[PDB]
Every structure is written in C-alpha cells, then in structure tokens.
Amino acid sequence: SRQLFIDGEWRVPILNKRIPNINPSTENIIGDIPAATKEDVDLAVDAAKRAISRKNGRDWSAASGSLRARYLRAIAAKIKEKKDELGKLESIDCGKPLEEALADLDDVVACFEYYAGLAEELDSKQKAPISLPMDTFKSYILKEPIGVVALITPWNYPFLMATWKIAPALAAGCAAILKPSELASVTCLELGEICKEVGLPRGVLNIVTGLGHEAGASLASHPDVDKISFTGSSATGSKIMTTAAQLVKPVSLELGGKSPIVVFEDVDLDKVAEWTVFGCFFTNGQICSATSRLIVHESIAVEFVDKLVKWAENIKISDPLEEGCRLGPIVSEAQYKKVLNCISSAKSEGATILTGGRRPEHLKKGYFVEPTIITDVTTSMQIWREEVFGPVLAVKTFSTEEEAINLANDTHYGLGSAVMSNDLERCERLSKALQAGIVWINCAQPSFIQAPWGGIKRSGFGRELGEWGLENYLSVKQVTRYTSDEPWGWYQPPSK
Amino acid sequence: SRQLFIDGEWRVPILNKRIPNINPSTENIIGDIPAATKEDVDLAVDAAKRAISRKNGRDWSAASGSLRARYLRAIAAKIKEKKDELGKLESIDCGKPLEEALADLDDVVACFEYYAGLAEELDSKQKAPISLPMDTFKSYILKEPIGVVALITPWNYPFLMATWKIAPALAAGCAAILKPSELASVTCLELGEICKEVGLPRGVLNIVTGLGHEAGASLASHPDVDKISFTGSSATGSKIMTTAAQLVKPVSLELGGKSPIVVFEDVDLDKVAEWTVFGCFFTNGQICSATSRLIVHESIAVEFVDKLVKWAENIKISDPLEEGCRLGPIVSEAQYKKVLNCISSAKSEGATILTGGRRPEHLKKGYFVEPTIITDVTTSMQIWREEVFGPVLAVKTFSTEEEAINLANDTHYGLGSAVMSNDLERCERLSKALQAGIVWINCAQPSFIQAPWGGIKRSGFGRELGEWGLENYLSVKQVTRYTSDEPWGWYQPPSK
Ligand SMILES: NC(=O)c1ccc[n+]([C@@H]2O[C@H](COP(=O)([O-])OP(=O)(O)OC[C@H]3O[C@@H](n4cnc5c(N)ncnc54)[C@H](O)[C@@H]3O)[C@@H](O)[C@H]2O)c1
Ligand SMILES: NC(=O)c1ccc[n+]([C@@H]2O[C@H](COP(=O)([O-])OP(=O)(O)OC[C@H]3O[C@@H](n4cnc5c(N)ncnc54)[C@H](O)[C@@H]3O)[C@@H](O)[C@H]2O)c1
Ligand code: NA
C-alpha cells in the first residue's frame, strides 16, 4: 500500500502510525492510510522549498509555462487512462455514487488540461506594460509564483478538490504540499504514483496524509509555507487563518454554506423540482454550495413541495457501485450521527419531517439516510441556520419578492444561491440582490472550470477556478525603470 | 479643532475624551484630536451599514460608477483649492519637509482623479461574458462592492495613505470607516469637512480618530465590517489578521520592509548617490519601502560610499516649514528613541558610523537625527535584519552577481528593491531574482498611481494602486444560467 509522497518517492512516516479507513456503505475497514506528524511535514516543506530554490538546476519557478504545461498534460493523460479504476476507488473512499465519481474524474482531466493551457499562455502575459503620465519612466509587471503552497482539501470531492488547487498552483510555478482529508485519501495518494510515472520533478508535489490536528496543523503553521489554500469547515478555516496570522501569510478560504434557492410561481414545476432536489441531495448532500434552504412562492408551495417529495422518494439508495445508484451513504459514522442529530433537533424544535429522516428499511448496514425534506420551518430554527452536510432540505414560503430576498440573505454565509423563474428580468434583479459568490439562474450546482468560484461573508474569501484560480497562486511584481539620463534633482549636490 | 465624522455629521465622542497633539520639531503640545472609543466605532459602522442598504443602494453602492465619479472629482477639486493649506497642516502634523507634503497633496488630487476615471469605466466591465464549452449554459461576472470597509492608515503619509485606500473604496461603491494614526490625524479630519461641502451621501465615509488599542481594535473586530485594509507595523498587522480570523474577514496588509539597493560598477556614481540617499533618507527615512540596505560592488565601494557621505552631509535639516528643508524631525519621542537605540545597537555589534548617528548641533529641540550611514555591517546584526524607520543606511559589499542577489534576498521582508547598472540585461536578470513586490531599476522610491504597490513575504500581501487598488474593494460574483429547455435528466422522474 501507499506511504507518504515526499521529494519524488514514497516515505514511511517517521513514527510509523496508520489511520483506519472505513467503507461507508458496509462499515468495514477497507484498508488504511499513513498518519503524518510534525517532522514528516517538515520534510515535505523542505522538499518543496528545494524544488523552487535558485540553485536547483530544474528550477520549477524559473521554468517556462509551456514546460510546466507538458507535465500537467501528461498528468491529465495518465489520469484519463485510469478513469474507470480511479472512479471506483473514489466511490469506495468517500461514498458518492459511481456515476458521480466518474464525472469528477472527467473534471479532474479537464482541470489539468485547462491549467496546462493557462500555463502556456502565461509566458505571453509576462512584462505586460503599464502606461505612465511621465516619459522619464517606464513600467511593467511580472507574475511570479507565490512560492511554497499548503493545499488542504475536503473529503466530499477528494480528487477534484485537490485538483482544483494543485493544477493552478503548479501551472503558476509553485511547489505544493497537499493534505487531503483522512476520510478520503486514496485517490490523492494515487496522484503521487502518477507524478512518479510522469517524472514530475522532485518536490514539486508532496502528499502528506493524516489527522487534521497533527499533519494539517503542522503544515499550516510551518514558517516556510508562503500560502495556505483551504476548503473545509468554518471553525477550522478560522483556526488556519489565526495560525497564518502569526507569520502574516496570505490565505484563501472556502468554507461551508447555507445557500438559498428562490423558486417563483412562473415556473415549470417538474423541471425545477429536479434542480432543487439536485441542489440539495447530490453528493449525498455533501456539497459546500448545497442549496439547502428552499424559498418557494406561496401560490405554488404545497404542490411544488409534494412534487419534491415524490422525486426524492424515487431516488435509488444503494451501494455506490450498484447500477442506477442516485444516492450513496454518508462518509463516516461521526458525520452520519451529526446529520441524524440535525433531523432530530428539527423535530424537537417543532418542524415537520415531510419525508425521509431515517435509515432506509432495505439497507441494514452502512451510513444511509433517506432524502429528507423539512417544513414548518421558522427562521430561528437550527435547521435554517446551520449547515447540515446531509441530504436534508429545509423549506420556507414567501408572498413578496422583497420577502424572498430577505429570506435568501438571512444567513452569515454567502457561497452559492439560485433563482428559478421564467421572467429573466426578475432573475437579473435577484442575481444582483443575492449576497453570494455564485448565482445560478434556472439551475443549481454546476461548476464550470472557466468560471470563478468562491464565497463572501462567513463562506470565506478568494476565488478558485478560471483565471482567478491561477491568480490565487501568483503575486504581482511592479518593475519600474528610470529611462532618463537626467539627475533626479531633489537634494542639493555637495560641491564636486 | 474638529470632532468625529459619523453619518455625514460632526459628533463628539460618547465618552468625550481627547488626545494631545505634539509638534515633532518643537516638542510642544500644538492641539488635540477626538479620541473615539468602542461606542463611537459602533455608530460609525452602523452608519456605513445603513449607507449601503439605504434605498436598495441606489444612492451609492448599487448606483452606477459615473455617479460616484462625480463625487470623487468634486472631492479632488476641493483638495486642489486648499492644497497649500493642507500641505502646511500635513507638515506640522507628521514632520515631513513642506515640499514633500506639498508633493503628497498633488498625489492625493491625482489619486481621486484617477479612481474617478476607473469608477466611470466600471459600468462597462459589468456582465463580462465567460466562455463555456456548452450550448446549454451561459455565464458572466458581476463586480460588486465588498460592502463596509475598515481603513487603518499610518502617520508617515497621513493624507496620501488614506487616499490610497478611500478613493478606490468609494469608486467601488463601498462605505468606509477611516481610522487614521493618532500621531497624524489632522488632514484626514479636514477631509470630513470636504465630504460635507461636496454633499457626499451620509455614512459613505466615516472618520474615527483615536488610540490604536481602543478605536483601531474596536473597528478591526466589529462583526459588520466586511473587509479590513491596513498599513502599519508587522506586530499590529499580525494582530489585525488574528482579529479578522475570528469571523473570517478578508484583509490586505502592507507592513514594513528592509529593502535592498544593489549598485553595480557600470554606473554614473553621482546620479546613483542621489537616488540611494533619496531611497533611504526621504520622508525622514520613514518609508515602508525605504532602501535601507546598500549592496555595492567592492571595486567602486570606497568612493561611492564617500560620495554618499558628501550628499548626506549636504542635506539641509531644519523645521519642516523653513525654505530649504530637506530633512525634518522624527514623528515622535518614542520613535526618536527607537531610532537612536538602533544606531547604538549597531555600535554594540561592532559596526562603524561613517556620518550622522546623532542630534544635529544647531537644532537643540525637536526629534531630529542626522542622516546616518553605517558600515562594517554583518548579516547577523540588528541594523541589517530589523526596520529602523529613521534616516539610517546600512552598507554591505559584494563582488559577484550571485553574491549580490543572495544578500539582497537575505531578509524575511519583501516590499521594495532597487537595481543600479547601465547594463539593462543585468537589471532584468536581477529584477527576476529579487524577492519583492516592487523592483526599481536605476532609481528608488517612486510610486505611480497606475502601477500596483504591495509586498510579499512578511511585508504582507494584497495590492493597492492601479486597477489592483480597485479590485481590493470589489468581490467577484459568478452568474450562471441554464438556457436550455431540456430537463436536467440526472434523476428518474416519478411519473406520469
Ligand atoms: N462545508 C465544507 O466546506 C466542508 C468540507 C469538508 C469537510 N467539512 C467538515 O469537516 C468536519 C470534520 O471535522 P473538522 O474538520 O471540523 O475537525 P477534525 O475532525 O479534522 O479535527 C478535530 C479538531 O482538530 C482541529 N483541526 C482540524 N484541522 C486543523 C488544522 N489544519 N489546524 C489547526 N486545527 C485543526 C479542529 O478545529 C477540531 O478542534 C465535518 O463537520 C464537516 O462538516 C466541511
Ligand atoms: N513600517 C510601517 O509600515 C509602519 C508605518 C507606520 C507606523 N509603524 C509603527 O508604528 C509603531 C507605533 O506603535 P504601534 O502601532 O506598534 O502600537 P500603538 O502605539 O498603536 O499601540 C500600542 C499597543 O496597541 C496594539 N494595537 C495598536 N492597534 C491595534 C489594533 N488595531 N488592533 C489590536 N491591537 C492594536 C499594539 O500591538 C501595541 O501592543 C512604531 O513602532 C512604528 O514602527 C510602522
Ligand atoms: Na473513507
């Protein structure tokens, strides 16, 4: 089995500890992953520092973008080869249905190809001139890699989230240390073998697996890390930023959400019913930007919600590998219990569990929850307030557009949001009013790698994907030159 | 004798306390400023919040850029009228030579004018298309104001630094709270009156003066502040970021530096002597990007450093308001003592003072220090590592280019840097190797409003000036719409 990927080969953790890896659908130990600690992390950062240091002959940061692009394209092609096997490992690892995992793999491939392309273009973008009011000065800018980057990623899209950061980071000329989640580490470790098979220069990508408070914390607080890029819980992101503050290092954060989907009356109920079920139940409801607060016009509310109930109850719940699986199990026991507790608390606070809310009868084992719709929701309820990370939808109703937007913005979060109405004039109005980083019109959840992705407010800051994803790993350098041959003439010259 | 500027009005601090104001050239109490406290900071942030939500933001934040442009231009014109008056106040307040303050005001006017232009251009940048590889989806970006912004500014360029922050913040559609330094708050308070005369919508700009640990801390930790932009010391920068981390608020930090100036042999000696002295002694040596580490080639070192002494001793030091003034006093007593202790510490470690390093004999009173150049410096010394923020130049010698860049990069800071040589191929090589946000070639210290300004490493992150300045106060929103009529087709419809 795999060890830590450091400096271009496999290294066993110094303390030789290992973490059990559970299959979410069976509850059986399916294997394990290495548990890295402080000094394992220290080796990773040194290797990354060495990968980009001047006196390295294969200086990754000083290489041309097209050279890095060749590595990225090769990484992509090797992943494309293993598509079917990597997707199967993905499903077993995190619990998402096979068709979802296979789609993620396609996106991984596209993501490396896209940033390979951007890497090629980057050389043309260097030395971009700045127009000045004086003729005595000339000015341009250089786009330089930020340096050594810590990449800390979630378990909901294990391989894709990692790729969302490593592809732009490498394309920019950075050396990376990746810390995937201890709940879903397998495919990211497979990326280490791919790097070996493609001859990625030593130390450019290092993969350190283990516990968040051991490996992750050590990585985040290491003084030689130049930038931390994070995706995960609000609390951990806060701790990570606190740690980064010690040595004043830049940070990008993508944290939870509690995204609204605003459904108006002038809508095809059935088409938008699939979207609202998708926005909340897809990835077993473990989406950062999940549209988990439904805000439906009162005039269609009860018939629209009834449709939702039928769609949701027709969703096939099974082992992720079984043909036709549209919902898998929650990633872990601890997560399962949190999701069930959220449903329990909603019931306790007086809300209605319209459908789901329990373990399905036909599956005795595994962390399975039926798609859950919750109504009679009040704005002070925990279910309205707190991100669930389970297939759980909370429903509220509205009578005016103004009320709809006030309900939509009734959260300290600000990641995603969706508007559903045929009136496109209304959609544009609502897309401006919704306090979010992403606004979907007449759909919910699609993330194209060409378009900037991120949140505002307690959902964090910074943008991934598109050209924004690359910039996240560049710094701007102003090169200003004095063209004239005249003395500056500010101070008095001495005498000679 | 002004008060706090809150919600478009002059208001006495709730607790009615005031802070004395010292003339740095006489050591006499010359006035006082209002001392805002937590209760006043709440009122200013509340007013800012109301300014963005008032009338769906149609008066400011959701208005077109041309509306804000008119205000910025109107402010510019007012400053320009009173530039000589504000220059005089600026010198008395911070202690810089009058011709420096006068030059600052020219830059203040041009800064408002420049961001007025960018405000007008901003409307045409809205809804910029994002190309997708699908027929079924369409995507564009909106550039929204980040919201309510905290602007914390230093005492070295009192009015200009405030302008660097507010001008792009207003152009963006933000509502700002300014917390100027308690050592130089006078011109910034005058800007309040300018907003009044110009009729700037209430709450768009608020000015809260006071102690850093009362007013500054209360502003930085306020839950309704959307973004903090800070320029000042490393320690405080670090504290701001830690506070922001609690509610995960984005920050931009410009901190100190220990910037290198590298002088090769193929150089006009008299011309670069001027530049080097300017690079280190200008603003009484209180520049963030001061080039305070000289790195000269051994072959020219002896006569180049001798010329440096000649220039340094010909710098006219006096009251900042006297006709020929070219160096004023250090801003305050505490700073004055720190600067003098830095020079003592150099002697402690065995370094040589070639000129200055003491009170000028003619001044007697005031916080004056002669322009100091020190030599026989070692890599391990405090004057090499730490920021003096006084007119104090440290000098090391080099022979090879590899030796030059390694000495230049021998710092945890990374704000500015300067190359001096007639060989432009060499200058370009060094500009790529120098780890800094600004690289100057054949000059030191000019900052054009068209070009991005900021640091890397422990000098901070984020960029001000140019279009980068505007972007600092904008957040990117992705708007994606499903244009197809076809059902999504992921789930199985429930019939019939
Ligand atoms: N919404 C999202 O974007 C998203 C994505 C993935 C996972 N998650 C969350 O992951 C959670 C799993 O637990 P967890 O990540 O909150 O803690 P954890 O179980 O990983 O570790 C427990 C303790 O370690 C601390 N810790 C973890 N990483 C740290 C680091 N890098 N530096 C300093 N301290 C660290 C945590 O604050 C906590 O006190 C789930 O509740 C799930 O909601 C959220
Ligand atoms: N290099 C630069 O960019 C630059 C520019 C201007 C001033 N300065 C520095 O200003 C210093 C003067 O003292 P000071 O600014 O370090 O402290 P201060 O005099 O403002 O206040 C003293 C204490 O309050 C704390 N504090 C100040 N503002 C705070 C805030 N907003 N939030 C939480 N704590 C805060 C400080 O950490 C310190 O412990 C000088 O040492 C000088 O070097 C540096
Ligand atoms: Na697992």
Ligand code: NA
């Ligand atoms: Na003063």
